[PDB]
Amino acid sequence: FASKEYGVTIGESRIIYPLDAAGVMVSVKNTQDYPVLIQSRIYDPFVVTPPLFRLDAKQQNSLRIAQAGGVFPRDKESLKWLCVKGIPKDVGVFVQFAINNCIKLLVRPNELKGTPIQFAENLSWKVDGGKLIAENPSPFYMNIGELTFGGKSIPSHYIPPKSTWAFDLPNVSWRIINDQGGLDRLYSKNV
Amino acid sequence: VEPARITLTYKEGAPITIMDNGNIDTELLVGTLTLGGYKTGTTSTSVNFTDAAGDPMYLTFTSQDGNNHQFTTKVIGKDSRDFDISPKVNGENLVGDDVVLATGSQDFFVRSIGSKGGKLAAGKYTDAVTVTVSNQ
Secondary structure, eight states: OOEEEEEEEESOSEEEEETTOSOEEEEEEEOSSSOEEEEEEEOOOEEEESSEEEEOTTOEEEEEEEEOSOOOOSSSOEEEEEEEEEEOOEEEEEEEEEEEEEEEEEEEOSSSOSOGGGGGGGOEEEEETTEEEEEEOSSSOEEEEEEEETTEEOOOOEEOTTEEEEEEOOOEEEEEBOTTSOBOOOEEEOO | OOOEEEEEEEEEOOOEEOOTTSOOOTTOEEEEEEEEOOOTTOBGGGEEEEOSSOOTTOEEEEESSSSOOEEEEEEEEEOTTOOEEOOEETTBOSSSOOOBOOSSEEEEEEEEEEOSSOOOOSEEEEEEEEEEEEOO
């Protein structure tokens, strides 16, 4: 049975973008044995440069992500996504794939006191409407990377700044993902 | 800091043969996708397989002889406790609740459904599929 390999690596798993900075740089590696076009998009207050370019087999290059316009809130973080796509009787089937590797672009004012892990423990929980609801009183996204309830794993999601998010039901335990993309310490609370 | 590496490996399944009436079999294993590199905690709802047809829940394969013969496939997998699960395919899940993906890598099976128009013809059928992963 023939196999085909695909891979795109971004040199970090989140971008913390200081609000109003000129730009940041992010590396892309084509880890495969064939050339690709790398197609980068944000989901136009940010530009990614270059938006499309040839990256040869095994090579790495750098993207510039630059705030070029956009006004944004001054008390809270904002969230965008940077997506990086590597473009490579019988019924014969031929399928080609392309990976579109997406990471968080977190726009963060410089003025805001501390970082996310200083506030990880501040999440409060309720159960309502058949759902487990987290409340985030911090100005940061709390990017939960691991979440359990009654000791059962719950697929996680971020909790937005000054806001909530609601989880289907399967004592709450959670770890946020910190700014370097590592898992942070375990917190636990009764609802 | 931690890179976001994503890999995919596609293993082709057995040859497909049209039968005497003109249908392909249903539930045929077209091939197996192994997704890798993601960080543990990545969930099934954060993976979306898309194609040009864009039919929600299915990947559409089209003949290359200009007669526009099509068939659909689903993309499905199994979680640790053997519940059927599935990634989004054109934006929607066909089966299962949202789940955390298996550690290290997750296999997904591309399985035939059928042709809505029917009678297929022998030849080559293709699809170009984007796999978007939204890293935590």
